Amino acid sequence: IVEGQDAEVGLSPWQVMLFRKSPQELLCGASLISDRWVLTAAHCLLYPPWDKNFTVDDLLVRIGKHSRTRYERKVEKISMLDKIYIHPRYNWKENLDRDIALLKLKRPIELSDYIHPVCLPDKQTAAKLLHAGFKGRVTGWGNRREVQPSVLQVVNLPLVERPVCKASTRIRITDNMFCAGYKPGEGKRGDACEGDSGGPFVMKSPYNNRWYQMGIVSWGEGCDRDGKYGFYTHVFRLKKWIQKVID
């Protein structure tokens, strides 16, 4: 996370670290959406252009953590995967369209004071909360510069409007992605960066006191570049498919 700050422990429970078995290595972010299901970006698993293609027997997940390195023995939970479901129409060749994935846990998870899911978006919430200017939040252990935090980081970024996102890149943008970030004249900074990928962009709803997962960190042209915004997967819209895998 570029231009963020340390998070208060217990800030983001639904924050999984997508780690690799050997040699140990962080690959991305993901989130807890249940006690057996994890959501992440598909490019974290399959991205052919870089020879990247992971199997269930290549990863682990360290659910519920704070210090990126010091394995906090009696508060954190490691787990192996059972399955990996990657959207079947995920465009990795062109624009990273539908860059979503659902990771199954070998066996369930003992929710704790530092582990618990994040709410998925329902039609009603999505409608009232997805408006430009409306800020959501990103957490992650990835680089703080285009160099890595000792603790989880946070940055709260505004949803930019559809036309401005499209005007900044030359990438065909789809219904399934939105962007967030500050525009050049705001003199406020922030962005996700390498390794924050797959992490969650959550927004809090005023009606009840719940946090919803609005989007999955996907791509960007650098990290915290002026006149460039960060793209996130539109969870609500791919939620139809989410139901299909968890069923």
Binding site: L11, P13, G133, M203, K204, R210, W211, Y212
Partner: peptide
């Protein structure tokens, strides 16, 4: 319906250092 509510925060009735921040942008301008 136990999703979204942070034990160390929501369930305890405590606000995080920058949560305020997000709530302003809602009633913005």
């Amino acid at each position: 319906a136990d999703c979204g509510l942070r034990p160390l925060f929501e369930k305890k009735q405590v606000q995080d250092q920058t949560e305020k921040e997000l709530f302003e942008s809602y009633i913005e301008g």
